[PDB]
Amino acid sequence: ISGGDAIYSSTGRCSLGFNVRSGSTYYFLTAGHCTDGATTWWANSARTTVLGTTSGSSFPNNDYGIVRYTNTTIPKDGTVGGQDITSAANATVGMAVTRRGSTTGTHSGSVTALNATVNYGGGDVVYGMIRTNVCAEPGDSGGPLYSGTRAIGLTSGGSGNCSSGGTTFFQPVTEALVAYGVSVY
C-alpha cells in the first residue's frame, strides 16, 4: 500500500498520505479530520484487511493524523503510487505540485498561497494551510501532495471539483513529521 491509496475507517473512506517511520516503527499519515473519532483502519471496504490503529489526531486548528501499522505482512511502500518520495520540503508560492487520492487519482497544479485560514464551519477552523489550484473530491482527504520526489502536504479540503476545476487546501507535511518525530523513507 502507498500514498494515495484508499483507507477505510468505521465511518468512511479517506486516502493514505505518506508511509513514515520512527526507528523500526512504521506508521502512515493522513488527514486529522479522518483520524478524528476513528480507531481502526482497514485496506478494503470489506474491512477484512487490517492496516493499524490511530496513534494521533490533530483537527481542527491543524489537519493531520497518524496511524500505527499493526499489519505485519502488507507492503509499506515509501512512494505515492509508483512515485518514489525521498524527502520533505516546504511549499513555496508558484511551486508545481501533484496530488494523488483514492477517488480522483492523480491531478496537478501549483501552490497559489501559503498560511491560509480555512473555516469548515461549526468551529472547525484550520490555520496555516497551503492553497493551490488542484482539485479534490470526497474520498481524496489525507492523500499526498508532492513535487517530484518531495513530500509537501496532506489533502484537507476545499471547493469545486475535478470537472469544473477547484481550489484545494493542504496541511504542510513538515509540521506533521515534526510533531510525531517521524520521517519519510
Added chain:
Amino acid sequence: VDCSEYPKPACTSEYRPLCGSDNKTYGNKCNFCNAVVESNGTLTLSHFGKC
C-alpha cells in the same frame, strides 16, 4: 441531515455518501448541502449511502 448552516466556502474531502433526489451520489454531507443551497432549495435527500 440539516443544511440550514449552509452554504460553506469549503468542505473536507472524506467519503460518506448521500443520495440526492437528482440521483446523484454526493460524496459527503457538506458537498450535498452546498448543492442544496446552489439549487435554491429544490434538491432533497433521497436516502443515505450511494444512489
